[PDB]
RNA sequence: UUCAUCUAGACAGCCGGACGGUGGCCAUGGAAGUCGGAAUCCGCUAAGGAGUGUGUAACAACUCACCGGCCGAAUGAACUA
């Protein structure tokens, strides 16, 4: 661009600015058509080099020929005042910068076209001719449109179709035809009441289109404005009646609207006699080779061609004809300047949506006004990188007044409100740079409706952010954006000494990008989650370094078995010590699974006074009143799932022996013995036991034996059973395909809960229980079984119960026991009954 | 109301919400059985039933959606008893 | 994708026929011996699976 | 033979003695509301579109009280039944022939004639009108409401009824799949 | 060989219904003519099974059992060597 560096001057006349996000499918025509319209700029390597694919700022995307993420456009456009006020806007420059971002397809990544959706101020979305809508340029097109954009559709590549695909008169027409009203009949899917008014027209310049290779697009405007110049007057009227009707031209003029002939044969196509026989004309004059008609056609329309480029033949004299009848600049750009608004105009119904107050400060009229003069407050979403370690961008936009460069505003949080002092941050700002396609251009000032570079805050924020400093205001919001929480991956370094590269390399990962989540396990493990399978390849990839600095391993994550026994413990079991001190009787009452989810939460906290925990049993559980006489203190950690007996005879005992009993069963309720870990829900009943001396012939490692054999036996003498989570998890998609969800969760052990309706049809979500054992790729193989458009969410809720029998190696239980102990690393579980059950 | 999917009569037209019943097939089941009908059918199941309870069934049968036509209660008892697999009702057919 | 009519007359004549279960040879819609002579004319046929 | 011994019976039982005789030859019908004409007609004539007896339903009139019997043995085609009355006729062809009650064809099947479309309201919510590819109708959404762009023809002489474009040919509502209750023959005693 | 069907119109072939009760009972979130648990039903009938097999995730769209019309007769199974 030759504004190099009038990039000032630009941002300050707040309506010629505008800023769009071109999103759609992967192998798809985006990355190209966007290097056409900086094309225009002066930039790219111009004379010629066609593939420059701006969204590169990195390997990993040449050779591919994909997209993760892209930074913004300068640019400004010359043309004449009499082609900009088709807009309703005032607007009074004639330069206008199309600070352009987007964000790619890939179902896998779109929660990131939200950071870049809920941010833009236009939506232009891409469709093929030869596939029409594919299935996720309308699933993440509609993720977000209630917000509102302005959804202008911009199809490409007419050439694979015009070359390849042998397309004749009708049925290209028949393309754009069923193409364009199938996508434009979706997106009145949720249009408002009154704005929802943007139902795409052909016939008012919307629907531009052309080739990336070939580097080419027009509407109807330009081809008939142009054209409009011969033939008639004027470019409204010919280009309004249009498309359908038709004209005769062998004998007259007439421009009726049938099909029929005063004799009765069919008319033709009013398009593509008016409008597009120079393609079939051009192109298929060109590509058999001839020289006889391609001078004389060129004669035909708008002398001349230039130069040396007559006789380069062969993809030359085909690459730069229509280049030289109009570029993508004065035709996709000016459809861009004619419809799509400014800030100040878009922005009137932005901030109601993003606004958590209500309709009340001095914001609801500096953000609805969107004044320059007014507080400085932002929003922050995405996090793009520069060629350190990462010191990242944050990408920011101002909502309202002129943001300056060294300058002093509060920070907040994600979910925060002023009141407290906790999580609200007061420091300054090191630099206000801008960028280009993967330069950078530092600033000073901007008004409000411009998204920027801001240098240095990244420290301060956690994958969003507000940075306010009116402090009465509330933080805008997250939304609850969109698809895939979702899926979790085992994470290891080798050689056992860079563990804080890894956790400083993760807990920079997380504030690096907002789609991917990273948590710890039951046993402060690492485990990372994801989005999908490719987005933990493309990321996770590199994490071995530009985020971490030491290569890794991947395993799939253990799952928290856990213990239970639940009938009533069928012997009255015996332990004598391995020194003759004593003996014990018992029979454990395994209690309801009513304490799984009632030994947590805010009903019971223990080590309370001891009658008020006996209203909570004797009125809540169905315990008696006598409980108070029952219970002392438990294990483990405080917390754990039991409340201790008293079974034993009440003449003298457990006054001196209770430090080194409630001492000695931490293992086994921290530890168990079947499977190896603890266990819930749990009682034994000690009835009997033995000090057959005083305090001095007893003590420490004498008496923290005494469970030695004793609940573990007892515990394990009834069923045993292993004890499994199982999520509640949730998984939307319109009822074209459900057909594979209910199926899929049948071959998985999973559990249908409900399914619910919503004013239309698409979004029909599902909950459904879905044990963890069996959870891995559960969201591949969802795909595989839908074809894409069907988005998992997934939750932890509870713990449920198992019953294949774990103490036998037979059943599921019994493998899961086996080969899990293989990994535990000890041997088999003991059989006993003469261990544990000492006959006395 | 009904454990069975139950069919209602009522078109949506301008102030029109009332769930009357047609008089269909498991909805005379739940008026002539006892009161636990609409009850005790969550683990149950029960294919009882031979006290002759009603000799004035025909009350329905300008409810009961007219199939035979021109006799008063012939065609439907043993309809029901097999289509109602509840019980019988009569000592008629089985 | 092509027009359905028309998916009605290629699939007839290519896809859904019958198949032999000794030799898998391809068979028409009703047929009771596999008429290559190897597998001796068995009576075990079942239908061709279904289109995708 | 025996059980066909009962098809006798309820073609003696109707012969004897009664005023009219009615043949309908009905190879089509859709039988669920044209027995609801039975149940309009409950009492009225019991049909006996029966058997094969074409030939016997004329030699078996050897009692000869009415002689006129023998009408049907040069008529051994068609699917005929008998229904009768001692009533004036000319009443009951009035609603007989009105059982024109509908459906789509078999996904498939014969077509009667060829249907022109004109562009008329229905007023639903979008359904299927992302899918109108198989025909391709330009049909456009407006109001909340499905209005019609352009007339295009959905069937044609020679063809017949579709699967791709005329499964959504009854949600226009035209009655192709009738061949409703059609008279051959009418005699009194 | 045994058991059957018919020139009183059998068999195959194409044209046709392939219901009302009643989207039968429980079950099932839901299991609507065709999916698990038993039973096992009448009017229309020329016919209808709790339906032969596809079909939506529950529907709606398809194929017969039964017998209507085709034209003029001998066929159908199980077996046996
Ligand atoms: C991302 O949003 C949610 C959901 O994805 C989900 O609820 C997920 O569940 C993870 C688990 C949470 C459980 C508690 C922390 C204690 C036991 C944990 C689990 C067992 O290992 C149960 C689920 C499934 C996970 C594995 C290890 C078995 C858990 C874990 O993270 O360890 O948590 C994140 C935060
Ligand atoms: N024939 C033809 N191929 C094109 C055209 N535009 C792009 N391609 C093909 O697409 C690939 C280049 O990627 P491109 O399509 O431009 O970007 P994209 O598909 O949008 C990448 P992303 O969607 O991830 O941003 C090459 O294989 C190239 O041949 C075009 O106009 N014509
Ligand atoms: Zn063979």
Same mark, same amino acid.
């Given at each position: /661009?030759? +504004? ?46 066609? *593939?420059?694919?701006? +969204? ?15 930074? /913004? ?17 005032? =607007? ?19 929660? *990131?076209? +939200? /950071? ?100 080419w697009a027009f509407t109807i405007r330009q081809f008939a404005t142009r054209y409009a110049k011969k033939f008639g007057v004027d470019k409204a009227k010919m280009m309004d009646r249009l498309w359908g009707d038709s004209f005769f031209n062998p004998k007259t003029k007439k421009w009726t609207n049938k099909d029929t002939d005063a004799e009765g044969k069919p008319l033709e196509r009013a398009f593509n006699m008016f409008i597009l026989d120079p393609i079939f004309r051009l192109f298929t004059a060109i590509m058999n080779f001839k020289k006889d008609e391609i001078p004389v056609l ?172 009116? *402090? ?17 991956? /085992? ?121 008020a925990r006996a209203r909570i049993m004797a009125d809540d559980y169905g315990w008696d009143v006598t409980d108070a006489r029952k219970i002392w203190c438990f294990g483990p950690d405080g917390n754990g799932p039991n409340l201790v007996i008293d079974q034993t005879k009440a003449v003298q005992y457990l006054h001196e022996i209770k430090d080194s009993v409630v001492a000695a069963f931490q293992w086994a309720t921290k530890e168990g013995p079947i499977f190896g870990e603890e266990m819930r829900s749990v009682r034994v009943n000690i009835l009997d036991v033995t000090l057959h001396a ?106 449920? =119960? ?39 | ?32 059985? %006892? ?19 009603? %000799?004035?069934? %025909? ?18 008892? %043993? ?16 | ?5 028309? #998916? ?8 859904? #026929? ?17 008429? #290559? ?12 699976? #279904?289109?995708? | ?189």
């Open positions: /661009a030759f +504004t190099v560096d009038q990039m000032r001057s630009l941002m300050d006349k707040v309506t010629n600015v505008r800023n769009m996000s071109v999103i759609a499918h992967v192998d798809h025509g985006k990355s190209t058509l966007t290097d056409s319209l900086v094309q225009r700029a002066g930039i790219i390597s111009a004379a010629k080099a066609g *593939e420059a694919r701006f +969204t590169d700022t990195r390997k990993d995307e040449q050779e591919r020929g994909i997209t993760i993420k892209s930074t /913004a456009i300068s640019l400004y456009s010359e043309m004449s005042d009499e082609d900009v006020k088709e807009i309703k806007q005032k =607007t009074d420059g004639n330069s206008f910068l199309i600070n352009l971002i987007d964000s790619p397809g890939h179902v896998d990544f779109s929660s *990131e076209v +939200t /950071a870049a959706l809920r941010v833009t101020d236009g939506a232009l979305v891409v469709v093929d001719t030869i596939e029409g809508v594919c299935v996720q340029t309308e699933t993440v097109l509609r993720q977000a449109l209630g917000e509102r954009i302005k959804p202008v559709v911009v199809i490409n590549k007419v050439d694979r179709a015009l070359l390849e695909l042998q397309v004749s008169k009708e049925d290209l027409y028949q393309t754009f035809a069923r193409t364009v009203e199938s996508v434009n009949v979706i997106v009145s899917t949720y249009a408002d009441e009154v704005l929802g008014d943007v139902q795409v027209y052909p016939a008012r310049g919307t629907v531009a289109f052309g080739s990336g290779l070939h580097g060129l004669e035909k329309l708008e002398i001349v061609l230039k130069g040396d480029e007559k006789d380069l033949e062969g993809k030359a004299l085909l690459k730069v004809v229509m280049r030289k009848f109009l570029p993508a600049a004065d035709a996709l750009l000016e459809m861009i300047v004619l419809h799509l608004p400014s800030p100040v105009t878009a922005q009137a119904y932005r901030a109601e949506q993003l606004y958590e107050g209500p309709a009340d400060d001095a914001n609801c009229i500096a953000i609805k006004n969107c004044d320059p003069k007014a507080d400085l407050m932002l929003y922050v979403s995405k996090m793009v990188p520069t060629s350190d370690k990462g010191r990242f961008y944050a990408f920011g936009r101002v909502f309202a007044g002129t943001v300056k460069s060294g300058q002093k505003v509060r920070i907040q949080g994600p979910n925060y409100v002023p009141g407290k002092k906790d999580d609200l941050f007061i420091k300054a700002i090191q630099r206000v740079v801008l960028m280009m396609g993967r330069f950078v251009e530092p600033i000073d000032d901007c008004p409000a409706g411009n998204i920027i570079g801001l240098v240095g805050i990244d420290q301060f924020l956690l994958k969003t952010g507000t940075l306010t400093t009116s *402090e009465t205001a509330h933080n805008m919001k997250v939304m609850k954006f969109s698809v895939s929480p979702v899926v979790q991956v /085992a994470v290891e370094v080798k050689n056992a000494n860079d563990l804080p590269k890894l956790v400083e390399g993760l807990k920079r990962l997380s504030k690096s990008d907002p789609c991917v989540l990273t948590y710890m396990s039951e046993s402060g493990e690492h485990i990372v989650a994801g989005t999908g399978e490719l987005h933990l390849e493309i990321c996770l990839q590199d994490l071995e370094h530009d985020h971490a600095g030491v290569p890794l391993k991947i395993s799939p994550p253990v799952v928290a078995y856990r213990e239970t026994v639940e009938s009533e413990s069928s012997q009255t079991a015996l332990s004598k010590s391995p020194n003759k001190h004593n003996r014990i009787y018992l029979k454990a009452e395994p209690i309801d699974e009513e304490v799984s989810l009632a030994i947590e939460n805010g009903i019971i906290n223990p080590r309370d006074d001891f009658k005083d305090a001095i012939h007893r003590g420490g490692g004498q008496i923290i034996p005494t469970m030695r054999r004793a609940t573990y036996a007892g515990f394990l003498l009834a069923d045993p059973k292993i004890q499994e989570p199982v999520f509640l998890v949730e998984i939307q998609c319109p009822e074209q395909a459900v057909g594979g969800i209910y199926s899929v969760l049948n071959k998985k052990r999973g559990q249908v809960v409900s399914e619910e309706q919503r004013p239309g049809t698409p979004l029909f979500t599902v909950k459904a229980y879905l044990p963890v054992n069996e959870s891995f790729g559960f969201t591949g193989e969802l795909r595989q079984a839908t074809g894409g458009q069907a988005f998992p969410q997934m939750v932890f809720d509870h713990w449920s =119960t198992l019953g294949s029998d774990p103490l036998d190696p037979t059943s599921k239980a019994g493998e899961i026991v086996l080969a899990a102990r293989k990994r535990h690393g000890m041997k088999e579980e003991v059989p006993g009954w003469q261990e544990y059950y000492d006959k006395l | 109301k009904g454990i069975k999917v139950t069919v209602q009569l009522k078109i949506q037209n301008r102030q029109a919400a009332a769930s009357v019943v047609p008089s269909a097939s498991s909805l005379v089941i739940t008026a002539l059985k %006892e009161p636990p009908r609409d009850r005790k059918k969550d683990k149950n199941v029960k294919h009882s039933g031979n006290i002759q309870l009603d %000799e004035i069934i %025909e009350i329905a049968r300008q409810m009961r959606d007219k199939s035979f036509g021109r006799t008063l209660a012939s065609v439907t008892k %043993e309809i029901l008893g097999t289509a109602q697999s509840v019980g019988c009702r009569v000592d008629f057919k089985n | 994708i092509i027009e359905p009519s028309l #998916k009605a007359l290629a699939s007839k004549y290519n896809c859904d #026929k019958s198949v032999c279960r000794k030799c898998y040879a391809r068979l028409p819609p009703r047929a009771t011996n596999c008429r #290559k002579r190897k597998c001796g004319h068995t009576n075990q046929l079942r239908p061709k699976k #279904k289109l995708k | 033979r025996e059980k066909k011994a009962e098809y006798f019976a309820k073609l003696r039982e109707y012969l004897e003695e009664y005023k009219s005789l009615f043949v309908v030859g009905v190879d089509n019908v859709s039988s669920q509301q044209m027995h609801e004409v039975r149940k309009e007609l409950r009492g009225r004539a019991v049909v006996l579109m029966g058997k094969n007896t074409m030939v016997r339903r004329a030699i078996r009139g050897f009692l000869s009280d009415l002689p006129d019997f023998e009408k049907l043995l040069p008529f051994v085609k068609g699917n005929v039944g008998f229904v009768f009355t001692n009533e004036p006729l000319t009443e009951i062809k009035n609603v007989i022939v009105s059982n024109r009650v509908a459906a789509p064809a078999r996904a498939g099947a014969v077509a009667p004639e060829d249907i022109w479309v004109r562009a008329v309201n229905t007023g639903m919510e979008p359904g299927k009108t992302s899918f109108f590819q198989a025909l391709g109708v330009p049909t456009k959404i407006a109001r909340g409401t499905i209005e019609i762009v352009s007339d295009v023809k959905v069937v044609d002489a020679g063809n017949k009824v579709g699967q791709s474009e005329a499964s959504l040919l009854n949600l226009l509502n035209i009655s192709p799949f009738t061949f409703g209750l059609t008279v051959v023959q009418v005699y009194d005693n």
